[PDB]
Symmetry: C3
Subunit: 264 residues, 3 copies
Amino acid sequence: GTRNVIRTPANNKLRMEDKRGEEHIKLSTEYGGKTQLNLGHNVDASRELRGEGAELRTDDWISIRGGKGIFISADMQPQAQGKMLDMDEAIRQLEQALSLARSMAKAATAANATQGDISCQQRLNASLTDLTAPGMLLHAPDGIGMVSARALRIASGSESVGIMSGDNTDITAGQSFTVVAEGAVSLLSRNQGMQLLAAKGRVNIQAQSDDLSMSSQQNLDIQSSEGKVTVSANQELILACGGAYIKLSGGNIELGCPGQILLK
Amino acid sequence: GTRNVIRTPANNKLRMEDKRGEEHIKLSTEYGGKTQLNLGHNVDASRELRGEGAELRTDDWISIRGGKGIFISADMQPQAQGKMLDMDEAIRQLEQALSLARSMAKAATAANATQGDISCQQRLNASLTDLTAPGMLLHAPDGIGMVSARALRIASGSESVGIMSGDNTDITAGQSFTVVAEGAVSLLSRNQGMQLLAAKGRVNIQAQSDDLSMSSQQNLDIQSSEGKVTVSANQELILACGGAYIKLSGGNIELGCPGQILLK
Amino acid sequence: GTRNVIRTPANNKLRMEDKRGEEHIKLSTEYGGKTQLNLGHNVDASRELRGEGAELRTDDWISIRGGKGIFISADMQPQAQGKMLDMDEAIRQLEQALSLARSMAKAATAANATQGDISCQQRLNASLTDLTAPGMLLHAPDGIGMVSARALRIASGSESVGIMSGDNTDITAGQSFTVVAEGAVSLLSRNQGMQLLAAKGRVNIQAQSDDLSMSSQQNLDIQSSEGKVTVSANQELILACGGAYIKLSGGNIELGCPGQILLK
């Protein structure tokens, strides 16, 4: 009743369940656990619903190989009406991310920050839009979670990794956040400033083989709240303001000013 | 022998291999290379094992479209016993990441760092848990690798990108690490301090239109090991410690202290 | 004509289209919208091409569960010639990312930066290579896009998140870039220096319970372009260069030098 089964003696089966409102197709082999494709109203052995939709499952490996590209999408396309690669919302996301990156790259240029790699991201947009190149596009309207107890790797071998967020980009490290860049490290805040804080542990800022420049347009405050402040130069220590200066150089101290030197 | 084949003249085939311990189902069309679904003990033309499990393969595009959400999981569910969306380990990962982010957000508040966006990550937990919203959940117990020779993009159009690690979060850039935030850039180390190091190249720290404050509770050391230290103010340069002060302002130098000024 | 259909009264169908050069297989159930597997030259109801390759689609959930690991790959394997888990290009990407991370870890050690977590990434390489452990490997030769209007999460519960780029790693936050590390925050630029810039907003650098050290090998410049520079110590303020020093401590000012003190 309402079950059409092509079953082999080895229990390779193609089962079609006809019960209206609970139709399903099961393509199942006994190898690798039950390696199965379950479509529709998927039930267990006791015919209780164990899931709705499409399940590709195995105890062994799963390989999904698309020579022209992979589109994995949580975007509803009811009744399969539309192209297989209909990705309008994913394309909107790609364009939004790219335009955000481009506007931020202009902002970085204006602030003399190191610009991002717009070229490879624009090329990625071209590649992934309609998957004209064999890329991979993962899109979900309600968020994507990539999780593992073990390590995760996101790696571009030859090009850039771009992370775009309309909101925050939050990194939470249970141990440490480390960046090694072969070229530059550039952090640009556009509106709300920058906080570089160690709740505990030493803060060490080094131009190990070059100049260090620390400037503000407005007031610059350097403070040790409970300890010492030591400023040491090897060649020359200069404090200058408004024509007045104090210079420590050679083995001399020079206090020069156009006005008066007052000792109180 | 042990091979049931529904083969069409165009070589559309549904093959069921019955050989015990090496059962497989092959659903194959000649279009797009061999566009195939291979289940179980998958063999090549010479009947040698080319893979175990489920293979969806084509020379053309692959589209995986789930209107209610996509669960891609390397979590063993032997004999398909359990719900199709049984995601207990993935849910544990989501909860662990969220609780880590929340505890770190409290820590950021305590340290006056810019807090992360907990709201969208909590909403993401709600969405992805059992895929109650059409999200995408990728979980593997032994790690996830997302790799390409070309560019990678991880982008949230309207919400936050959250990266959580029980261990380190390491970024290794073959060229440069650039951050442009529209709001704030906030780096908080909780226990082991902060190292901002340029092995080569200039270190430039600017509050381009605002105040810069650099403070330590303990000793603050500013040093040029081989060059000069220049401290310049536009309005007023003040060095103060213990009631003593040196002020460079106007065109004057003022050395004030309640004790003695000693020149040696 | 050229259409072999196993159709049930409930419209569970296995359709094989034999038209040469446009062959396709359709496995379709009416449940969950049209929950379907479409292989090959996939057409709509009016027999117009709606996509080429393999489509797994449903209005409900999609579950892809591989107990031994998931390989999702946009790597062409023409005519299914080769192993199901043939991942030579993906393995090259994994090795390239790992070797980049290792060389950068050595560089971080040389610069006294906090080293990254190479161990878990090396273990991830071992796990994902041929999927010897149940990991997940996503590889596309032409780039990977992971996008959502909603939040994204990349999380390792117990291990590290590694981001590797042959080129830049760009982060573009529409609101804020926040890092909370339980241990250290370490930014190492190898060649092109470091820019920590707030176009607007206060720059705040704090060793909240420890020492702060700011050093350059070459010239160190501290400047307020339009405001004041204030240097305050609690215990002792020392400016030293070439044997000369100015010390503010107790309530005293001491100017000591082996040469001469010149007031101009």
